[PDB]
């Protein structure tokens, strides 16, 4: 049951990240881009950082 | 006609020998480059 909840949570985060930043999804994907969002905190605070960062 | 060779290399980079487009289409790419 927790594996099924993993599957639908993964589809949730994929579709949600496609709705929030489609440029990110059509570069590296929802998981990796979502973890960048999670590190810096937010989308504008990820956008305020340079490319080396 | 001055054409840098790397654009014709770019015509022949992807889809190596098999799974390349047929050479009517590849020739249209080449003559369209020229």
């Amino acid at each position: 049951e927790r594996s099924e909840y993993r599957r639908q949570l993964a589809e949730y985060l994929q579709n949600r990240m496609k709705a929030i930043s489609p440029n990110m999804t059509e570069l590296i994907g929802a998981l990796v881009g979502a973890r960048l969002i999670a590190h810096s905190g937010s989308l504008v605070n990820l956008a305020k950082n340079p490319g080396s960062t | 006609v001055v054409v840098a060779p790397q654009r014709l290399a770019e015509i022949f980079n992807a889809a190596p020998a098999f799974a390349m487009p047929p050479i009517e289409d590849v020739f249209y790419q080449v003559a369209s480059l020229f």
């Binding site: 927790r2 594996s3 909840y5 993993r6 949570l9 993964a10 949730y12 985060l13 949600r16 990240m17 709705a19 929030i20 998981l31 979502a34 973890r35 969002i37 999670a38 905190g41 937010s42 989308l43 | -």
Partner: protein
């Protein structure tokens, strides 16, 4: 769309994979007493839980 459910969503994916990993190994031993060979010829915990079921 909002970003706080991104960061909480991937946090819940991390704790989800963690707790599913410890519960998965928990059923590896927890059935592994009655039948030990299943973890040896089956490495994957998903197919392990399906064949234990």
């Amino acid at each position: 769309k909002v970003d706080v459910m991104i960061v909480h969503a991937v946090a819940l994916l991390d704790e989800l994979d963690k707790e599913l990993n410890v519960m998965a190994m928990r059923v590896k031993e927890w059935y592994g007493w009655h039948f030990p060979e299943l973890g040896k010829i089956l490495p994957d915990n998903l197919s392990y839980a399906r064949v234990v079921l």
